[PDB]
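TEACHING EXERCISE
Course module: macromolecular assemblies
Task: Read the component lines below, then compare them to the predicted structure of the full complex.
Student: A.B.
Group: 4
Components provided:
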Amino acid sequence: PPLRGSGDLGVLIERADGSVQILDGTAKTSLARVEGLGDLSHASLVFSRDQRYAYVFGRDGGLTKLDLLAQRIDKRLIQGGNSIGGAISQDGRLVAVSNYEPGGVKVFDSRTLELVAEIPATRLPGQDRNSRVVGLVDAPGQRFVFSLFDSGEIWIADFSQGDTPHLTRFRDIGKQPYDALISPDGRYYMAGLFGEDGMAQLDLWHPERGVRRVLGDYGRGQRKLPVYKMPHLEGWTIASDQAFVPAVGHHQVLVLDARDWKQTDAIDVAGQPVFVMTRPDDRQIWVNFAYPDNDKVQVIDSETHEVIETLRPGPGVLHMEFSGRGDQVWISVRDADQLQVWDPYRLKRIGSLPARSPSGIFFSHRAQHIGL
Amino acid sequence: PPLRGSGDLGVLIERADGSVQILDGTAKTSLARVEGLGDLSHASLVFSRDQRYAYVFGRDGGLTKLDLLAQRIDKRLIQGGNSIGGAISQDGRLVAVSNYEPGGVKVFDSRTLELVAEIPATRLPGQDRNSRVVGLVDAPGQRFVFSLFDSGEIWIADFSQGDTPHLTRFRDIGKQPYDALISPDGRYYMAGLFGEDGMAQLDLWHPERGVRRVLGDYGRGQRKLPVYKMPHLEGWTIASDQAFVPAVGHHQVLVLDARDWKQTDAIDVAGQPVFVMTRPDDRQIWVNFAYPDNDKVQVIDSETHEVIETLRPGPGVLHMEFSGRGDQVWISVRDADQLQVWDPYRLKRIGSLPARSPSGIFFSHRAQHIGL
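Instructor-supplied answer key:
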């Protein structure tokens, strides 16, 4: 294909067909469809540091190195037991993937996909399997950080001195950490708890201070919510002073003091929030919802905490993604087989591309940001 | 040339020869030298939103659209009176350049370099001239914001409706604003004053609130310092709570409370600071100095405010540039004819490339960030 820049390239997951579309974000057009990625019914991805490749992590444990410029699969491996949790290191050389069977982290060379390190999680007493690993992120200092669901731990894997990592293990951090995030500046790791309420916070500048329990009320309490009905911590937005997060099993966006981790306001919204996102200029909060309210997207003023507008793009709004500078927001409408493009200042639709059951949408500016 | 990503591509200014080198940031190599850019003895640049092109603003008023992938000049014009102050719009379509003759802002189609809007500054009495324009930035909302040195004004040019902007003019903001910055979140515009002390701050979210004077004692005071010896506001670094900035004519880096805009600390450093930069993870502050101390770079712990180390890359250290995720820092050593790449976590040089009087070094991840 002809020469083109990689800075405005997007990847759209087609969740029922094991395929992706590669998108020209500036022209608002589809460049290609690539097939052969297996089970993408759930999927995530990261980009190489030059933006030429996406690493797609599929529900089948597939790891696909996708060449966005040659518009083809470059390399692919399938490892049963690997999850969609995948991350890329600060220097772009290592791609880590969590696994839930037997439980641990595997780290691959970003060029060849050859195995560089296998990190088994704690072996469960009286068993021949390990703790599931969840909440894998990359962090500054050529580190990966992740949580152990069954045994209640957080570990740091430090690759700064070589391919055999230095491991730091924090035990008894909380019952069943099920997901985690790293703050946008790369300093704080926060794991949400499923076996009790609260979140476990680690200051990655000062890991010697240990893990700190914060936001002690945030969780399912005594409700029997399954794991997958808990908030996805990717659906948290953390600003400088404020965080906007989905309520656990309620139709509210909670506003948190991001310093003391206390709720300061609550916003009634048109459904159970699934993802809470920020326009890149921090002035608007964008929210999508769980079925039966997943035909709507609400836009909230970050200052007044009032709903500005309720958009209705169509049935099955799974994911959204802003352009790097925020001139666009892209919205997957699964049950309308459309990937829409909107102007988030006018709140008007400026494009709508056909797609097969579209889900995750990712643009290549993620390549330059820790945690993405 | 062959297919390659754009995400790790950089541009190095060779300031005496009117040329640049295009750099592969991952391989740490030079891909090409491109000549024919006129007078780059002063120069700045921004990138297209697909990271394929750089727009180089030359001291001769040259505007060069440089193809990083084809490794050639794609388009070039020379606009009499244009300054090196240039910026690119939130949607990537418009490139604006400040102008001292006749005085105003010129706006160009980023694809063709067609002149699409001319904004004259306020007229000056008794001359066939307008105020010269300084401190031009892009801002969210498809805006450009700039200051008028001679008439003491700040203007917002809103291009959201097309090529004819809507202008909001703030008068009597302070005597002789000489430079400006926009905060990393894109919310606040701050112009430094030369005719008196202090900074003029405009809240771009609430322009109806006008311009407020902040940091009222920061300036040259009663000292007869010429405008060209005032700090360049590009050399300010603003974090969430703290700013680190060059003192005005003192061998100190000032720590400012970013919320109340008041100095809280002053760090003794090895010369007159020129640029104060932050490692992308906010842990370290990097400082370069004016002659005769421009053979040194100092690294400061952002928490303790102490100098960690004094680096000596060589003579004439004019500029530094971090990679997107912070795994690298690139340092131009003008009088060694060397561009060095350093590991900012080990604080050690890891490689060098030859260059002719290297000055500015810019990597394409800037394409994704308001104000860069």
